[PDB]
Symmetry: D2
Subunit: 339 residues, 4 copies
């Protein structure tokens, strides 16, 4: 039966999710929208030819009994309150990352969800759905390279908007690696440290350090070195290498485009848009959510607990940014509810 | 509104299309099925949880007024009669390849379709929807390597079933390149020639020559060299290189799986299944057809005319297979109906 | 002993051989040069800091008793007369390919050398010395991919000089593959056919067809498909793929230059000339020649017989060029002198 | 005229250099040897068919006026004393790494040589001569990727002998990166920090931590992250990536061996031997030294100053190994003598 969806926040990613649900994926319909910019919400309805009602706020939308699930796609800082409101209903909840912008907010959500008769929140950490990354994890898990010793990763982005701040290097960019690595390794973090190499001349934003180097450590002692470089110019790229005791695994170059021999070079295109890079993962993640809601079963994707882990680690990273010193992480054990 | 589909032939590929239409793609519903094996048809209904009627044959299914489009997914030899029957209705028609198993059957279909007010047939030549192959064509069409002079291609398959005949090297295997190349090059074929290199010791089928080399010439003068190797053992692989005046284009490695460094080698997995190789293409191809039907517009994918070109070329190749001599091809000018 | 060398022809490759003999290789000194362009000869002496005599012609240089060995590095069509003259002396002879530009010329050389007390000619078929190509042959010979069924090869040049003729597409270019494949496969040819794809707009030489396709068949039934493309623009490249019963072997991309990520592309440099692509092969073959001369022993590298065997096939291809028809080949057995 | 060489220390690398001078390269002759193991010295002369005198010690060898240059290939701890002695002569000096085993020893050599009328010492840091590494440096120096911000490198080795110590991870292994980076970047080091990920189960040596992570900083702010992994099992590999403001540069795939398609995989061999990996670099380095001596000009390769830089940095790294703390490095501005 069709999953009736309400969307809270009809901006860039909200519209992208509306588009997915309407024109790409199967088994859902958007029947309600709201945005603090009412005209934006109206436009979403028009642009996507929805049979949907526009509500003036989240509270009103959440009162609609016909809605089976809500998508929270507002500003990050608005997620916490909205998710908490939604938990007063029986509706399933897909929230874009972050779960909340503070670790305390995340904890509030976890604590509230724990009181319920079903897990209902999935968080939009799409990396876990990317076919390439999953294939690497699968291969790692065969034991073929032994224990993971070091992970080297890159998060490369061409340029940023004028409103992109230093802290967003963590909260908008590194956050993906923050969620991914503990999942990839089936391990828990023990520390994070952010260091600043020489400042790029390409940076146009006051206070923004770029590139940034992030070193994370895990309980088993695996060290993760992430390069974050958001004014890299050349392209958008995600790189991942796992160094094991007996071998290595790395993600192949992304892209299906041809190899060009021309002008004394052999070349392949590099993606310029994060949007295109993770199109598959976004579709897969959302389809999975919808498929679960259709069965009235709890989501199986990243949970509020994953959101909490991410928020704790992001907080630690933002602390590290202040003086470039290592910050310890010690997350509580995973409640059975979230296993 | 949803496109209501009837499926004629509920075998391996018929079920795969049903699965696509039901569980993967958007905007369609299978409401009717038929198969000469009635038990298979019934199973398809149960297996995919369809709300669908099982009909004794194609004729009866075709009388169902609720059906917007039919999928013809029976034995190749059955396609012609069914497509001709379907053309007595107003319904849209997706037929799997081949359009017909004979040249004359293909023309009968074309002649019949030409009598209609709009085009309704799409033929399942999915290569055109493969992202890698499409990306190559697109790059070619930028002019960046100048005019295409030579095409070198491979269709590699690990092993064949006992029913695989010499002529199937053309009709089941090369057929894909036959449809693909004239599209790739915006050109028309003038001849085809099949040669037999030394016979592989891996061949276990009566009368099968393997490998086979196919050489096609085009009106603009491009020479196409295809290696067909169906007992290759190592994997399933589709390779494509275009040699231009000022450069070359080739398909990259297919696969998202990781690069493994282990035991004095660096390695990546090779696909063993054509099914897996073309999952995406099948999805894109069918979604497009459904999207067209939903708008009541003619299909924009490979047409009955393309089916005809394929059939003519395949026939010529089968003739060449008899003595390894060149066989001329002179395809009629495209009717405006198919422009 | 330091081998005293004379060089006949001091153009691009003459200079390159002088360079290697003077600065890289051991046990040789260039003591004499000649070129029909006196200024070119003088430039070679100057540019490579030689204490060398500049002779007005080959005959005078050949009559200098102090010269131990001569290198024939003139225009291909000039090799025959020079080699024949040199055979009137007791000097060792390294000639670049081709041995001659006609079958009759090659035969004249063989007939003359057979009258001598020992073998003195080495032909510059350097492909056999290339580490990559050798490594491929070695792997093939392990049986890991079973019997070789088809070979696909490319011989790519960016452009040609004004003196490059249609006939030279065979005698200067394809001649490498002619020698290479029979060595690689330990097989002999039964036929050759040259075909002319769509003529490139990049051709600037009257009478030159480019690209050209060569199909060679061997006694064991292996079919070799060579692409000759000498106005390719993009670079200089040699490609080799062997299709076996149970697998494939391919030469990797050549180059040590870096991978550049820049401007929405990932790219690596392509060689623009043989001079660098085959520097190792040239070094090895020439050092081997010099080492034999130093011991007053016959060369162990490719012989005038190899040159003649190649010339037979080359002449067959030149015949095929006229009408694009297949030409049969059946070479004589190797004389004892050349075993 | 031929460069007459004396070799001090005729062990593994000593014999390798003798072989280079005797068989591989042009313009030199080994005319004297010495080793504390007088039988090793005798074996060298014998095995390589040398016309050389065996001297009882370095002092006696250095007094031989016919010797143009000496190679110091004894135990590392024995270089300092031997070098300082040779500096009492006018002979050119090629010393293997290290220049000295202490920065104090290195400083003494630097001070002594600085009193001489011209530079005579080259240190055997062969990385700088590796074609790929040089090609990358050169591309970097074009400015095409802007300023270097981060360098990521790997020094991967399959296994170690029973005598390999924790300190050797620096002195024998990382030392190559230690010399290479400041040269690559034309910059000076300001700090080094060694950190230990989880210990590999493959380690069989008391006290050896593997892998190790080395972080170096430069004056311009470039951060260098090196992974040292000496029990990696899979192969020997050197990886290098430079992250620039506007792009990236990395070393390409190393290897000439074929690509094998077999058994559901595509694979290429990985080098297992550091010896084989850097064969070319060793040859080029020594040939350049000989060429300089031949012209009676100072060496142009890595100098005593470079050896001093390496010694300081290695000492700092050995210190950091104790507690994983960052150790500052302050190298004096280069004397013009060494520019
Ligand atoms: N998982 C991923 O890779 C990505 C996640 N996101 C997340 O999606 C969320 C939205 O980002 P964008 O769409 O790019 O930003 P956006 O700025 O384009 O849109 C946000 C929308 O939310 C509306 N809004 C703000 N506060 C609201 C509230 N309290 N209630 C209702 N509506 C409100 C705004 O008016 C705006 O239309 C963010 O949390 C972002 O981090 C965004 C892009 C990629
Ligand atoms: N485009 C592509 O890549 C592919 C195309 N195909 C095409 O799909 C068609 C079906 O192939 P598969 O599903 O693999 O074969 P299959 O043998 O598994 O299924 C064929 C089904 O058709 C039924 N059938 C036969 N004659 C019929 C008729 N007159 N009316 C109704 N049903 C009839 C059979 O009972 C069977 O259930 C073939 O034409 C094949 O060439 C199949 C696979 C891939
Ligand atoms: N093995 C290989 O990969 C290569 C082989 N070659 C061969 O080397 C030879 C020379 O080629 P390039 O140096 O590239 O050509 P080039 O055109 O640069 O030089 C040819 C030189 O020969 C001189 N010459 C012509 N006729 C002469 C004669 N009768 N006596 C003396 N000198 C004469 C010309 O004046 C010119 O200086 C050819 O046989 C060519 O096929 C050339 C390049 C690569
Ligand atoms: N640049 C590179 O990649 C490499 C550098 N090396 C360096 O080469 C040097 C020698 O290494 P190996 O040959 O591997 O060691 P090895 O132990 O095989 O040989 C050293 C030889 O020196 C002799 N010896 C020791 N002290 C001596 C003294 N005071 N005077 C004369 N002879 C003496 C020993 O008896 C022995 O025969 C070391 O400094 C090593 O670090 C070695 C291998 C590679
Ligand atoms: O003489 C050169 C030489 O034979 C090269 O190796 C070949 O690549 C060029 O085509 C030819 O003109």
């Amino acid at each position: 039966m069709v999953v009736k969806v309400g969307v809270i926040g009809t901006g860039a990613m909200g519209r992208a999710h509306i588009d997915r649900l309407t024109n790409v994926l199967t088994g859902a319909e958007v029947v309600a929208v709201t945005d603090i910019d009412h005209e934006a919400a109206e436009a979403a309805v028009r642009d996507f030819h929805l049979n949907a009602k526009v509500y003036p706020d989240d509270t009103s939308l959440l009162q609609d009994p016909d809605i089976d699930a809500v998508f929270v796609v507002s500003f990050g800082g608005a997620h916490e309150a909205t998710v908490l409101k939604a938990l007063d209903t029986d509706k399933f909840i897909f929230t874009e990352k972050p779960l909340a912008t503070t670790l305390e907010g995340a904890k509030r959500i976890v604590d509230k969800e724990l009181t319920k008769s079903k897990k209902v929140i999935q968080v939009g950490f799409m990396r876990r759905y990317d076919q390439g990354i999953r294939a690497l994890k699968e291969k790692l898990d065969t034991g073929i390279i032994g224990a993971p010793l070091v992970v080297r990763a890159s998060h490369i982005n061409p340029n940023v908007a004028s409103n992109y701040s230093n802290e967003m290097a963590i909260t908008d960019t590194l956050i993906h690696e923050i969620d991914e690595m503990h999942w990839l390794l089936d391990d828990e973090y023990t520390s994070i440290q952010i260091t600043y190499p020489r400042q790029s001349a390409e940076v146009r934003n006051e206070g923004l350090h770029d590139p940034q180097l992030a070193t994370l450590t895990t309980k088993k002692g695996t060290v993760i070195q992430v390069l974050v470089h958001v004014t890299a110019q050349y392209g958008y790229e995600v790189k991942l290498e796992v160094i094991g005791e007996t071998g290595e695994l790395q993600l192949p170059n992304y892209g299906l485009g041809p190899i060009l021999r021309s002008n004394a070079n052999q070349q392949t295109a590099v993606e310029m848009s994060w949007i295109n890079r993770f199109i598959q993962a976004y579709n897969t993640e959302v389809q999975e959510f919808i498929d679960e809601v259709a069965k009235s079963e709890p989501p199986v994707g990243p949970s509020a607990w994953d959101g909490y882990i991410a928020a704790i680690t992001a907080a630690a990273a933002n602390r590290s940014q202040k003086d470039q010193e290592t910050v310890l992480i010690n997350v509580a054990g995973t409640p059975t509810f979230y296993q």
